[PDB]
Short mmCIF file of C-alpha atoms and ligand atoms in Angstrom, two decimals:
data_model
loop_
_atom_site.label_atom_id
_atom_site.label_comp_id
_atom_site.label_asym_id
_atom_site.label_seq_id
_atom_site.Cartn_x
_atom_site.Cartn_y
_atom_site.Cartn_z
CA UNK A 1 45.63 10.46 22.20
CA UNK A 2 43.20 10.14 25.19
CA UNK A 3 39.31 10.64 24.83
CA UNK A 4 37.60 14.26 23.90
CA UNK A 5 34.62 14.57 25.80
CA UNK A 6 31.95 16.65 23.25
CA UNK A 7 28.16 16.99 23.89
CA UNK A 8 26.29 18.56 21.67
CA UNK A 9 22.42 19.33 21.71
CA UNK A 10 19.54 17.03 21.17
CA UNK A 11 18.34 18.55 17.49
CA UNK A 12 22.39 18.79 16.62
CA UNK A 13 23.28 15.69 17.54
CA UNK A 14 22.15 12.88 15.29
CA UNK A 15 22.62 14.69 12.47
CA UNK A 16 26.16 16.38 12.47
CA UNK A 17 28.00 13.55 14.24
CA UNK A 18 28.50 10.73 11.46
CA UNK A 19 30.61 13.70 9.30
CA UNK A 20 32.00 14.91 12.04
CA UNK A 21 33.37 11.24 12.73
CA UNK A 22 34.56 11.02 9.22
CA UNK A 23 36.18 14.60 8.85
CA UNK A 24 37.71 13.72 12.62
CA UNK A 25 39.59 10.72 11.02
CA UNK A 26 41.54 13.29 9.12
CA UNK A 27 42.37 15.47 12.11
CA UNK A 28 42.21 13.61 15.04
CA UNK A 29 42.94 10.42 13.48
CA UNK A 30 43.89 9.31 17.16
CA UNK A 31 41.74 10.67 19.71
CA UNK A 32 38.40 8.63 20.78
CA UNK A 33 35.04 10.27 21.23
CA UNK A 34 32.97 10.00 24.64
CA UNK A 35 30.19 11.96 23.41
CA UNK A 36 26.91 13.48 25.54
CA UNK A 37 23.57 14.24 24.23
CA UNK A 38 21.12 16.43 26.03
CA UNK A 39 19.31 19.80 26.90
CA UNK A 40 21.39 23.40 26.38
CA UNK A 41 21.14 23.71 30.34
CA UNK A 42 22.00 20.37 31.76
CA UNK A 43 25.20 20.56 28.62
CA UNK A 44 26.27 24.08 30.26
CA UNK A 45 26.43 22.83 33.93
CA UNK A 46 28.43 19.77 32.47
CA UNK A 47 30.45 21.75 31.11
CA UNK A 48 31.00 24.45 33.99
CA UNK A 49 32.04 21.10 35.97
CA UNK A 50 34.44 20.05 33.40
CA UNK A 51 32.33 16.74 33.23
CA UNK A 52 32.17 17.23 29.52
CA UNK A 53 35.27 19.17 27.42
CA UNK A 54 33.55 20.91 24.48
CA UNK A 55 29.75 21.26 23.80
CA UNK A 56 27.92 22.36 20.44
CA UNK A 57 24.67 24.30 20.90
CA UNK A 58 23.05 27.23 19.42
CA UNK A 59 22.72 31.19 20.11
CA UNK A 60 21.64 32.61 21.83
CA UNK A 61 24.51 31.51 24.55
CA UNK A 62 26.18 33.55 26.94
CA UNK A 63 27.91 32.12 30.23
CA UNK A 64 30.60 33.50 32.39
CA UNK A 65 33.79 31.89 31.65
CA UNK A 66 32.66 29.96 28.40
CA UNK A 67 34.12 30.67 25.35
CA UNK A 68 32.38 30.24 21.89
CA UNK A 69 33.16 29.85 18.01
CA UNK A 70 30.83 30.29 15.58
CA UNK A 71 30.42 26.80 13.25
CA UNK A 72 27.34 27.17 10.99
CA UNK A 73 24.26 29.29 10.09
CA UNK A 74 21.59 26.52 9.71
CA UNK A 75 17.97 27.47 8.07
CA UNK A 76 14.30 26.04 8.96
CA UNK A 77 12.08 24.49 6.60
CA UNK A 78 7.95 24.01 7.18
CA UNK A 79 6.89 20.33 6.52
CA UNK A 80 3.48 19.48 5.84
CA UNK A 81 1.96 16.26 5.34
CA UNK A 82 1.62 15.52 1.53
CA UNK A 83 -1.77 17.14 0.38
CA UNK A 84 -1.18 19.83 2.70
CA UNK A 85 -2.18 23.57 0.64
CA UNK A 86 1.36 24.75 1.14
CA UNK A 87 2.28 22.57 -1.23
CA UNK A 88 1.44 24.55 -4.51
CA UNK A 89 3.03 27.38 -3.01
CA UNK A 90 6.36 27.86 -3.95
CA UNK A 91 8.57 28.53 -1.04
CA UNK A 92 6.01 30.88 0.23
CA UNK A 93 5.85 30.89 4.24
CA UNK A 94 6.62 33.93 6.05
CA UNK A 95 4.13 33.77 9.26
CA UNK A 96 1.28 32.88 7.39
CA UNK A 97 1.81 29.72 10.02
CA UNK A 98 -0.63 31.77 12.69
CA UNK A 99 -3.47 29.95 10.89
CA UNK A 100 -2.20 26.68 10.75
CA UNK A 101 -1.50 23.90 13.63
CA UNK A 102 2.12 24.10 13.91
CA UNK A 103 3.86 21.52 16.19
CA UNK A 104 6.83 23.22 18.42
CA UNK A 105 9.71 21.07 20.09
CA UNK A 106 8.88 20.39 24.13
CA UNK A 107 10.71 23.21 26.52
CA UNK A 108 14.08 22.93 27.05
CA UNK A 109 14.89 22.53 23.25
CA UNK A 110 16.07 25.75 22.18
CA UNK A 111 14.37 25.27 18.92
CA UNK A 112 11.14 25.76 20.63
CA UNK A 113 12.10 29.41 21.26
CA UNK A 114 13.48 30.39 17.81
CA UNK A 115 11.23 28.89 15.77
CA UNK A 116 8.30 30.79 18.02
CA UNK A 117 10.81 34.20 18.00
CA UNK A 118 10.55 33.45 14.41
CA UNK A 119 6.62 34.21 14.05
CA UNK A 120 -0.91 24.73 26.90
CA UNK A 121 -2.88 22.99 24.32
CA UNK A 122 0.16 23.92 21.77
CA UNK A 123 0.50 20.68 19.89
CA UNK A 124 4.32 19.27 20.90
CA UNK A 125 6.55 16.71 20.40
CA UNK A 126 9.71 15.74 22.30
CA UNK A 127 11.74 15.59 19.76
CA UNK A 128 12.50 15.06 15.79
CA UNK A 129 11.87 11.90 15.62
CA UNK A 130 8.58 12.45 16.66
CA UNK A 131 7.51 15.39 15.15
CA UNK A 132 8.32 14.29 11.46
CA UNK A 133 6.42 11.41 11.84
CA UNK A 134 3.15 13.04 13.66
CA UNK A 135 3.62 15.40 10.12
CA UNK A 136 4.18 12.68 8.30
CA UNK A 137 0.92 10.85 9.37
CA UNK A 138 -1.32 13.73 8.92
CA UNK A 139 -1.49 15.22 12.85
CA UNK A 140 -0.03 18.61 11.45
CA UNK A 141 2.51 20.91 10.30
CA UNK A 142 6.15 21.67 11.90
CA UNK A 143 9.19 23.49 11.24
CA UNK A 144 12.69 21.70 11.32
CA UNK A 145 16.36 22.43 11.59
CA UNK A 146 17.50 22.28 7.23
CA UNK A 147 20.03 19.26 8.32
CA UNK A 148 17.61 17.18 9.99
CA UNK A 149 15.75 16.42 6.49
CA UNK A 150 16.85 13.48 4.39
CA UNK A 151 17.15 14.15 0.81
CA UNK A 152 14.84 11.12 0.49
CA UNK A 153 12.16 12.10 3.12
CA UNK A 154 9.50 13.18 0.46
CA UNK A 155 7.94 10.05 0.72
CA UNK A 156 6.70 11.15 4.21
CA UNK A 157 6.05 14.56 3.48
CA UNK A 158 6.89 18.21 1.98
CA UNK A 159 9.12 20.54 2.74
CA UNK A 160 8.04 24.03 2.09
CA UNK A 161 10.70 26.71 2.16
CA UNK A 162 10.37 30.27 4.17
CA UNK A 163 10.49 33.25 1.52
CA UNK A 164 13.24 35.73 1.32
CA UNK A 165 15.69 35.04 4.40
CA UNK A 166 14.71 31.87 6.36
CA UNK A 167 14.64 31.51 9.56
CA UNK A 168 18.03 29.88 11.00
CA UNK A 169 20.05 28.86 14.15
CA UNK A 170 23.62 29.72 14.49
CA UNK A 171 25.45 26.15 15.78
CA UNK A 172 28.77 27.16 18.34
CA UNK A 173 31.17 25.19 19.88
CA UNK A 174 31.45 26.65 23.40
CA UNK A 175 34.20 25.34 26.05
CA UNK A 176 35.57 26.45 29.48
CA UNK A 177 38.43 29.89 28.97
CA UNK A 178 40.86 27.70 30.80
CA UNK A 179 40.15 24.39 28.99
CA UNK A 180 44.35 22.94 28.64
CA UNK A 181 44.16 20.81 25.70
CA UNK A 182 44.69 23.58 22.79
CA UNK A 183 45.39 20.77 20.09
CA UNK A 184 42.41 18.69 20.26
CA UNK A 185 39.70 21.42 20.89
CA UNK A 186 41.51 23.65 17.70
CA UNK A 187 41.84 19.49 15.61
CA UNK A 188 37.89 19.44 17.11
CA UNK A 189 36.84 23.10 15.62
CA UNK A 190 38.44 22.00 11.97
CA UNK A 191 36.62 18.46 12.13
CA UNK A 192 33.23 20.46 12.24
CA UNK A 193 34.25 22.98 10.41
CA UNK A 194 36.01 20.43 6.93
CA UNK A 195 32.87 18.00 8.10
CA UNK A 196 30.77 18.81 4.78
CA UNK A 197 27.33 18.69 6.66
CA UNK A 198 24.81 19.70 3.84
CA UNK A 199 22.15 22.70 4.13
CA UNK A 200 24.24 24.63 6.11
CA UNK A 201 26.55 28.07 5.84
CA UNK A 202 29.61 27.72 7.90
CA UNK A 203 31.03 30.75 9.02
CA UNK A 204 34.34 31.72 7.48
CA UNK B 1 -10.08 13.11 15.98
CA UNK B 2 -9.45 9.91 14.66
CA UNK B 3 -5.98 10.32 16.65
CA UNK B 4 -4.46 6.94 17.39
CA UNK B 5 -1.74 7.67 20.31
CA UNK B 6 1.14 5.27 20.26
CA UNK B 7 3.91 5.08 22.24
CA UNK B 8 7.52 3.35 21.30
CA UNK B 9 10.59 2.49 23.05
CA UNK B 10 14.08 4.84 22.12
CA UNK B 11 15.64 2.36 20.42
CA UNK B 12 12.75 1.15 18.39
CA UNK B 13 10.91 4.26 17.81
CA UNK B 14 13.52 5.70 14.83
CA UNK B 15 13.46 2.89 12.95
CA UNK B 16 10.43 1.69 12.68
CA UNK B 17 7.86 4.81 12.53
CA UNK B 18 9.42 5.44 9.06
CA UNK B 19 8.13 2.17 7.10
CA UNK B 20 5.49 2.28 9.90
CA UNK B 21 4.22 5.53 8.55
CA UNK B 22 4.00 4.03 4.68
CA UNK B 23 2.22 1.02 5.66
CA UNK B 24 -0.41 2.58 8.03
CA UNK B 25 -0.69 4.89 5.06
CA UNK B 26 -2.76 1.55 3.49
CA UNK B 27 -4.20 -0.03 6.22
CA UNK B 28 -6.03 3.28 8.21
CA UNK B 29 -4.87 5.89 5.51
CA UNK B 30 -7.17 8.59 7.62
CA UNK B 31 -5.82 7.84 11.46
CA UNK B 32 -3.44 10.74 12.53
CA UNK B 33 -0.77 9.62 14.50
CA UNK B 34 0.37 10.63 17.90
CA UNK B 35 3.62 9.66 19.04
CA UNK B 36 5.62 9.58 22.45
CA UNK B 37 8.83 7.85 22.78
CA UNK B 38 10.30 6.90 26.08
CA UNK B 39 11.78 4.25 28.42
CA UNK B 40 9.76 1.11 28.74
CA UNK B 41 8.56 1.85 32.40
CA UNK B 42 7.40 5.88 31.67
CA UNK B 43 5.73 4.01 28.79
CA UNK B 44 3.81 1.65 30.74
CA UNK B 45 2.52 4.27 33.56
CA UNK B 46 1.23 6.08 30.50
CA UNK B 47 -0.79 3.28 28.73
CA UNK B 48 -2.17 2.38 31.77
CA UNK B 49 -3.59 5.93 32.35
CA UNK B 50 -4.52 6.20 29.02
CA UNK B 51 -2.75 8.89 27.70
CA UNK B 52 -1.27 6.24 25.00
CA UNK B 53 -3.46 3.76 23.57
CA UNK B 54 -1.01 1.55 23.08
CA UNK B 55 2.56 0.75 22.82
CA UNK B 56 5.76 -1.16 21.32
CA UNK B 57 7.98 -3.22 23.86
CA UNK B 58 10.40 -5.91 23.98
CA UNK B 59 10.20 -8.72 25.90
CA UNK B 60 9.88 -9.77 28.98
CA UNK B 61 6.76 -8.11 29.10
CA UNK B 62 3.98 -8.81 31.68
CA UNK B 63 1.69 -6.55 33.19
CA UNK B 64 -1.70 -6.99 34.91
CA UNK B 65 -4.87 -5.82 32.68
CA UNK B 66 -2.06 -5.12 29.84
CA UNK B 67 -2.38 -7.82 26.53
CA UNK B 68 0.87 -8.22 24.62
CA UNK B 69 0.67 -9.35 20.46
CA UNK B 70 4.16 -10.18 19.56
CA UNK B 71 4.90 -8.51 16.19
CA UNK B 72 8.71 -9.65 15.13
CA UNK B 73 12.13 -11.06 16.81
CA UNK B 74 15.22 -8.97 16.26
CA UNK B 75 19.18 -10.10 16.00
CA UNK B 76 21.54 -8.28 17.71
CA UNK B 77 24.93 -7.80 15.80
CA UNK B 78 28.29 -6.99 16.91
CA UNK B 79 30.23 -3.06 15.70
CA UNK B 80 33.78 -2.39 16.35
CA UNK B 81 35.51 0.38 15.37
CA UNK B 82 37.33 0.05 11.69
CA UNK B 83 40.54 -2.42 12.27
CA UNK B 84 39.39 -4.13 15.26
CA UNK B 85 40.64 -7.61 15.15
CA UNK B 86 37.08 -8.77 15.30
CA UNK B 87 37.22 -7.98 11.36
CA UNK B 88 38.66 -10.65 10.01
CA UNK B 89 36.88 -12.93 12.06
CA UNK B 90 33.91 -15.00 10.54
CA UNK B 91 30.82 -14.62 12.05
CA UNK B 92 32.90 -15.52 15.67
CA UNK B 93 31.33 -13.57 18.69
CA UNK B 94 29.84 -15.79 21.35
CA UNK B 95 30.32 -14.12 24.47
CA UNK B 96 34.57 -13.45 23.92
CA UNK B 97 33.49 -9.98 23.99
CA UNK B 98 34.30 -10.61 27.88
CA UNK B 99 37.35 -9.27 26.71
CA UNK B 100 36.42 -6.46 24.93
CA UNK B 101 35.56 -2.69 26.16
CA UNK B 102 31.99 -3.04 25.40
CA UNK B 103 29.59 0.32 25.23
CA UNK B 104 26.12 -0.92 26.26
CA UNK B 105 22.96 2.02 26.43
CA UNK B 106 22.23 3.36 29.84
CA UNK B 107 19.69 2.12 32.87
CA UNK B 108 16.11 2.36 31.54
CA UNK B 109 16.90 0.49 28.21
CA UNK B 110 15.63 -2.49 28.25
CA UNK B 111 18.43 -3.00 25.63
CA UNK B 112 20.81 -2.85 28.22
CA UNK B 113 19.54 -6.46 29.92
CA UNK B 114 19.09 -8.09 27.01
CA UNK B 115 22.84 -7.57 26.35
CA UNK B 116 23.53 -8.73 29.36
CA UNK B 117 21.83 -11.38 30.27
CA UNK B 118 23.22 -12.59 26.84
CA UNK B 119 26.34 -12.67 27.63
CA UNK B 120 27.73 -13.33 31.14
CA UNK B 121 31.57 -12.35 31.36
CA UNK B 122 29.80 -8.47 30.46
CA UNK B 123 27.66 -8.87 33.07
CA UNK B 124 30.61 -9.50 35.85
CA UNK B 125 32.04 -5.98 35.41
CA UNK B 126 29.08 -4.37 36.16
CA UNK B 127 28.72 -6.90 39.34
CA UNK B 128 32.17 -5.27 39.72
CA UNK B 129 32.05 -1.20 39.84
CA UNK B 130 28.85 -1.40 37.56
CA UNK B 131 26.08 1.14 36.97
CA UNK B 132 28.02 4.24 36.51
CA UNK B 133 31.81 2.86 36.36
CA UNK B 134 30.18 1.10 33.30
CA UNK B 135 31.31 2.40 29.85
CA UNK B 136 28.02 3.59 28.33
CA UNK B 137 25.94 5.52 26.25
CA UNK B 138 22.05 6.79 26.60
CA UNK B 139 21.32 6.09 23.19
CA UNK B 140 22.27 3.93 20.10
CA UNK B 141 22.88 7.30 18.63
CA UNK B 142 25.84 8.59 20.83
CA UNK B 143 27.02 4.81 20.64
CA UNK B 144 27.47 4.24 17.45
CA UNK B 145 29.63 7.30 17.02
CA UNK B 146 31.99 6.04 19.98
CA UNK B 147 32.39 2.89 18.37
CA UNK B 148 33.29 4.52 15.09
CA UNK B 149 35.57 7.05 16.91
CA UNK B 150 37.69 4.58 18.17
CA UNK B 151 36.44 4.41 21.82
CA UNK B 152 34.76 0.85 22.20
CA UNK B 153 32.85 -1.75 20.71
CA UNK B 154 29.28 -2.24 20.65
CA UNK B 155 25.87 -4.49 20.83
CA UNK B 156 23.11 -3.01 17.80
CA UNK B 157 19.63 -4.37 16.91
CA UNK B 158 19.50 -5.25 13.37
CA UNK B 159 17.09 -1.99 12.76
CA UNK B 160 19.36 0.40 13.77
CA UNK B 161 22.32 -0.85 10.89
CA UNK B 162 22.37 1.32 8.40
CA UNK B 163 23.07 -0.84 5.47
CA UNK B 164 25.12 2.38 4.23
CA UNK B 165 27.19 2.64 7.20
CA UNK B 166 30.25 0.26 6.81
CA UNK B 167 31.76 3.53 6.50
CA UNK B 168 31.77 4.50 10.47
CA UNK B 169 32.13 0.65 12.06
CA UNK B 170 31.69 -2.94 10.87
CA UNK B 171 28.96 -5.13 11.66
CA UNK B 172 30.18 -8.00 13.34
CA UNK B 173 27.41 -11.34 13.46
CA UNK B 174 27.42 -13.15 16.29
CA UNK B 175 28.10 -16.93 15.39
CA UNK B 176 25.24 -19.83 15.46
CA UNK B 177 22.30 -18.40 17.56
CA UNK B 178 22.13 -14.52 17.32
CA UNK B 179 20.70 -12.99 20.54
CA UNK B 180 17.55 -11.44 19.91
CA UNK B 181 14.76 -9.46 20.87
CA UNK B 182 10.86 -9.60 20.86
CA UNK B 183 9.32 -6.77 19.65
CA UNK B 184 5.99 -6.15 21.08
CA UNK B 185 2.57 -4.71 21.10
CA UNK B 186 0.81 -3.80 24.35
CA UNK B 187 -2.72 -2.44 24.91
CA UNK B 188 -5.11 -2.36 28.12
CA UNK B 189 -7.34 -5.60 27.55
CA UNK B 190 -10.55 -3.43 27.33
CA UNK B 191 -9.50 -0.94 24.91
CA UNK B 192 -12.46 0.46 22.74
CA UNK B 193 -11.14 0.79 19.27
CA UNK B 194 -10.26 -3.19 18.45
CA UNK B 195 -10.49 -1.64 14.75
CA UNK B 196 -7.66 1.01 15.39
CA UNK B 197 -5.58 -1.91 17.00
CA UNK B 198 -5.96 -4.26 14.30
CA UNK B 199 -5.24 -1.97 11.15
CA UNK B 200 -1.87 -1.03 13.57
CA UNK B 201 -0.97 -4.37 14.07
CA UNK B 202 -1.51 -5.25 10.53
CA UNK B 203 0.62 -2.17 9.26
CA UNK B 204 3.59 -3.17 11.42
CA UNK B 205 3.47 -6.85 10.33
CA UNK B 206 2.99 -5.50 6.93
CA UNK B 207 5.86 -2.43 7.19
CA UNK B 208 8.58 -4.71 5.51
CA UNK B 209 11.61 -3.58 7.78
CA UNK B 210 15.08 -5.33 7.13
CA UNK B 211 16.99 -7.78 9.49
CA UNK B 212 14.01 -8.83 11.26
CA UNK B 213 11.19 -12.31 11.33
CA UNK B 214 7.65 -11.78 11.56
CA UNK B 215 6.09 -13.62 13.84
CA UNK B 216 2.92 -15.47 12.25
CL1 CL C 301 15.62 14.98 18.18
CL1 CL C 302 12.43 -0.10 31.87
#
């Protein structure tokens, strides 16, 4: 088989890719990956142009002519750097995060907007990478995607759960109505969807 | 505040804040980090304004009213996909990677020289249609996952090998002399805080990352 083109967001990326390699073994045990990473808007263009084949990003998304498939519901978390109050409470953070220095995602990340839809000088990083390790260090708090935290990042700091339902992003796979490849596209949606990515609900 | 704001390369940043983050954590356990990751040359512009106090480069680095303190060297290693020939090889890649399809990161990596200038038969392609003909990825990230997809083979620093992921690709040394990097540390020669500096310095040289020599 000949090369899938998939981009997928920047706070997607990193994390759902090396299962999606492994599970994509078992379906597409033939087809290469040429693989994009980059904003919702500049992955939508791509994709209008045909540049890229299949992109993953997260509702809400609606484009003439796109199609999308639900993949996952994916919940937030609130880390705070270790001796931060939070961390007696239980999972106890509803928007009780107006009093507190939260650090957001820069603009273009759509996790900016539903982390704020959630609850200038706003304290930001430009990316994941960053913003754990501001958190970690002490600069503040932050609230991250439940598949971008490493079952062994409590040495850096806490993750404090939201009460009752959490927060979450809903992870599609969007692609042109006319795309022509049927079999890799429907071998992609089942790599994703068999990948095993932890802290996530895929929808069934 | 007590803020300290650093700045890192993309392809160092990942790897190093988190050990980074556990040895500051001894050395100025009260100086909140803030962090900025970008290409060498944004990076530069941003120290020199002061909007970063200081940042972490590879060589060559030289820069006007800008001090470098070298902190460690860095080998690069060799990933194929799983099955590539390559595999049963030794420790065997020179430069015979000429004949290879060879991902390399895009323009604005320094990463992307220092591959090339390493080898030579890599760097005649991109004499050839180069600079956007040229198979590549922006980051290690997307790169690793081509490699392990099937669609190429790769160049990795040390850092970024997972020493639990011989399940995507296989690490492939490069025989005799690895290529190498020099990581860096760059400040404006009249910076205020030579306290700040020094407990950073000291962290870094003290952060025990794998597949890397200190330099002392
Ligand atoms: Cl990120
Ligand atoms: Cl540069």
């Amino acid at each position: 088989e000949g090369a899938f083109k998939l981009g997928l967001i920047f706070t997607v990326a990193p994390y759902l890719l090396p299962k999606l390699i492994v599970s994509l073994r078992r379906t597409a045990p033939k087809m290469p990956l040429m693989l994009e990473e980059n904003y919702t808007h500049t992955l939508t263009e791509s994709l209008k142009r045909g540049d890229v084949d299949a992109i993953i990003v997260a509702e809400p998304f609606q484009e003439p002519g796109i199609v999308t498939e639900p993949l996952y519901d994916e919940p937030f978390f609130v880390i705070v750097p270790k001796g931060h109050s939070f961390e007696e409470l239980d999972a106890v953070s509803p928007r009780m995060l107006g009093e507190e220095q939260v650090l957001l995602l820069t603009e273009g990340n759509c996790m900016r907007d539903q982390v704020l839809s959630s609850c200038t000088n706003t304290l930001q990083g430009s990316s994941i990478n960053t913003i754990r390790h501001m958190v970690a260090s002490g600069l503040a708090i932050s609230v991250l995607p439940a598949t971008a935290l490493t079952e062994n990042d409590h040495m850096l700091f806490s993750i404090i759960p939201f009460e009752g339902t959490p927060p979450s992003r809903r992870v599609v796979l969007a692609y042109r109505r006319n795309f022509v490849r049927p079999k890799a596209l429907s071998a992609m949606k089942a790599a994703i969807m068999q990948s095993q990515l932890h802290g996530v609900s895929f929808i069934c």
